[PDB]
Amino acid sequence: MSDIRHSLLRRDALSAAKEVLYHLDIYFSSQLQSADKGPVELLEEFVFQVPKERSAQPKRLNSLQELQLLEIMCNYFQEQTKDSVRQIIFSSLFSPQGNKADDSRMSLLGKLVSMAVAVCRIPVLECAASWLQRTPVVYCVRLAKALVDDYCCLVPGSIQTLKQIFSASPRFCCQFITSVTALYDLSSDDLIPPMDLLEMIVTWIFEDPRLILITFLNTPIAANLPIGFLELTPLVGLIRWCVKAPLAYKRKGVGMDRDSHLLYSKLHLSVLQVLMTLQLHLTEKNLYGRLGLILFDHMVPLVEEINRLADELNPLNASQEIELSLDRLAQALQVAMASGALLCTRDDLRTLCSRLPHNNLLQLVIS
Amino acid sequence: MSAQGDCEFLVQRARELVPQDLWAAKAWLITARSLYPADFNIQYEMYTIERNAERTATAGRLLYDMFVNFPDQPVVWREISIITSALRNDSQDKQTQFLRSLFETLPGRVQCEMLLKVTEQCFNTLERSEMLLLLLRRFPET
Questions:
Q1: Cβ distance B36 to B43 under 8 Å?
Q2: CA A189 to chain centre
Q3: N vs C: which end of chain A shows fewer Cβ within 10 Å?
Q4: DSSP secondary-structure letter at A226?
């Protein structure tokens, strides 16, 4: 009834919102076996500090009452002990509902997820990872980039906390790797990975093949989702990032970032273990179906992006870097062909090499 | 079809990769596939470049399996002789201990066959007898 809503439409730290959420979750759990948009939208708007009326004042702003409500929600979610209920609540909270505070609601949901990760709410973190899997790559990747920018830029320890969570949660680690690859698209200066985030990623490359395998084995994959439902294998991003070592200097004075080549190369070297693990998981086992691995015909887009982005004085200043990047790309293509990740035959990338700088690695890739 | 040249280029790349991080050299060495069984001596040299316990264990597995696959390289015989001598004496070398651990990690039949091959190669009476005695001590059933 609307009387309960009115009784829950007062104060920004009110426990009535938590009681309403618990009752709705219990109703959903009771009816799940025999299985509303409006109630979830209203609950999110109440959390987002936007009132029930579409054009009324904000629901009591934020202040310390919003922090109290967030703490109460985190405490309830950690002790919720219901994967489906937590996943449904997380999906409802961070979905674009068209309200005036939709982006702020998504940002607050990401903030709560970061708080849960800091609180080591492992079941809640897993539910958030599943919700991100059930969310568009654009909004989820933007939220991940915002959370990474918030944490990594602070004092040391946030990278340590992220690495510890990645060691604990492998699905969250794979989602974070995919989100980092999507953010570090080599598109601009901001696309250059930050030092702390890159250090955490490089340090967390001991179980990256294991995390990728865990993400692959977590759930069978359907057809291509809408713009990517958190694809596990972000191999193209890592391969480009290794290639984009001189791109840090190219995008920028000019020589602002040039020492990251070795760390990226070390992180890229983990793909050999990932390639062998993927080969064992697909070719050796019965998982040799579909396209081998997550390719999505992105190899041609990757080659086109490499050709387009490398135009910044490739001839003499970055000749050695271009040749090394060509060798890395050839190694990635050979790994994909041997491991079966790229089911397509030749000329899919050999023709693309025509619009790339000539190197001995190009002949080696052709050979 | 320019296969020796590719091996030479890979050797030069590995030589240039010694100063840099070993992960990059390992990644470059892993994805070769063109003539890896023929260039397995280069892979053995790369595995012997690293001297960690895990690296030595992986070397003692992979290189031994390749040598069983390709029993015609004198480098395999040299490694087997070094492992046998390491078992006999000179325990002060950690790499010798790693080679001895790799030799003992193999099955008894494989170790007996390797010792028999070394003894057959050991034309000297003393060396052949000592190798046979060590094989009998390690493997009483041989």
A1: yes
A2: 19
A3: N
A4: T
Report the distance separating Cα A353 and Cα A100, nearest Å: 48
Contact A143, A107 (CB under 8 A): yes
A116 in Cβ contact with A78 (< 8 Å):
yes
Q: Which residues of A touch B (CB under 8 A)?
A: 262, 265-266, 268-272, 275-276, 327, 331, 334-335, 338, 360, 364, 367
Among A238, A272, A363, A364, the strongest candidate for a mutation testing the B interface, having the largest count of B CBs within 10 A, is A272
Q: Is B2's CB within 8 Å of A334's CB? A: no
Final resolution, Å: 4.1
Selecting from A262, A331, A360 the residue whose C-beta is nearest the C-beta of B27 gives A331
DSSP A256-311: GS-S-HHHHHHHHTHHHHHHHHHHIIIIISS---TTSSS-TT-HHHHHHHHHHHTT
- Beta carbon pairs, A and B, within 8 Å: 42
Q: What is the DSSP string of B95-125?
A: HHHHHHHHHHHS-HHHHHHHHHHHHHH--SH
Please say whether the dihedral angle defined by the alpha carbons of residues A48, A49, A52 and A58, taken in this order, is positive or negative.
Answer: negative
Technique used to solve these coordinates = cryo-EM
